[PDB]
Amino acid sequence: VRLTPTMMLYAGRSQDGSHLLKSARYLQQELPVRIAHRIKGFRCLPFIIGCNPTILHVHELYIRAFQKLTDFPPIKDQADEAQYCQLVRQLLDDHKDVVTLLAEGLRESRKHIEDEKLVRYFLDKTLTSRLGIRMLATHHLALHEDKPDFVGIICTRLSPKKIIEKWVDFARRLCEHKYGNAPRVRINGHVAARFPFIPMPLDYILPELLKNAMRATMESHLDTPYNVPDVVITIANNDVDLIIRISDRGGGIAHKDLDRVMDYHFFGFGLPTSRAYAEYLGGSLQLQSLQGIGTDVYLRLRHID
Ligand SMILES: CCCC1=Nc2nc(NCc3ccc(Cl)cc3)nn2C(=O)C1
């Protein structure tokens, strides 16, 4: 069994599938507790915010999810567990545009936001809660799968070089469509590291950070779009954490914008959600700006037990 903040992803196996029931019964009682905490966060929002028709709609979705989940009887066998997976899959679908509806509701409410820390902490708690819930749910759904090098959602031999390469090719495509070119990426450091890790957090953070590094490079080289400097990624693997540094030669975040980059913009969500995700899983996301030259972004993530 693996662990992250206060959650457990069961790594045990059984011939008779009894491991699926131990995991499903844990999931069955954890999800309503996690969803009730989000309802409490919605009830504690300032009145003027919480009664915004869009924010109110998202609040209602959370009440419907807790209702559908608590109205599901306790899981007695494989047949019960199978139907519980259908409910979980329906909730993941009904809450797909929750972040889109949140930023859209909070944008209208911007005329009443005297303190930006309120919106940051509400979005940090809401976005990390869905990460924890999606990880918990998709791990269980993946315990039925017979994937190679995966115990549920935990990759038994994850290669940080390989996962970075997958998202570099993705970001270079978006970059190439927008600007006609994309900076090449050079990966150095512990390029041969292989270890147990959950890819899902990296699968959100990496494409966002890579998009930012490539956008910055392109925006600071309008003169020569066909010839832009490389983005350098350095991998540092050790017993405590995995460090992935992303360096760009994109001019750097200006002194007057240094605070604004880590806040939610109404959408500029990549950097603040990535930092919330990193902190939620025991890590960090730090920025080092060399104004006039570029930015160095340090992503640290704690290893699995
Ligand atoms: C297949 C998933 C569809 C997706 N389409 C997307 N379009 C963008 N445009 C923002 C952007 C483009 C280029 C640079 Cl350089 C920076 C930012 N992002 N994006 C996704 O993340 C996923």
Swiss-Prot record:
One of its GO terms (molecular function) is pyruvate dehydrogenase (acetyl-transferring) kinase activity. Keywords: Acetylation, ATP-binding, Autism, Autism spectrum disorder, Disease variant, Epilepsy, Intellectual disability, Kinase, Mitochondrion, Nucleotide-binding, Phosphoprotein, Transferase, Transit peptide. Pathway: Protein modification. One of its GO terms (cellular component) is mitochondrion. It catalyses: L-seryl-[3-methyl-2-oxobutanoate dehydrogenase] + ATP = O-phospho-L-seryl-[3-methyl-2-oxobutanoate dehydrogenase] + ADP + H(+); L-seryl-[protein] + ATP = O-phospho-L-seryl-[protein] + ADP + H(+). Its EC number is 2.7.11.1, 2.7.11.4. Its main location: mitochondrion. Signal peptide: none annotated. The modification N6-acetyllysine is found at residues 125, 166. Mg(2+) binds at residue 212. Belongs to the PDK/BCKDK protein kinase family. This is Branched-chain alpha-ketoacid dehydrogenase kinase. It comes from Homo sapiens. The lineage of its organism: Eukaryota, Metazoa, Chordata, Craniata, Vertebrata. The chain holds residues 68 to 404 of 412 of the full protein.
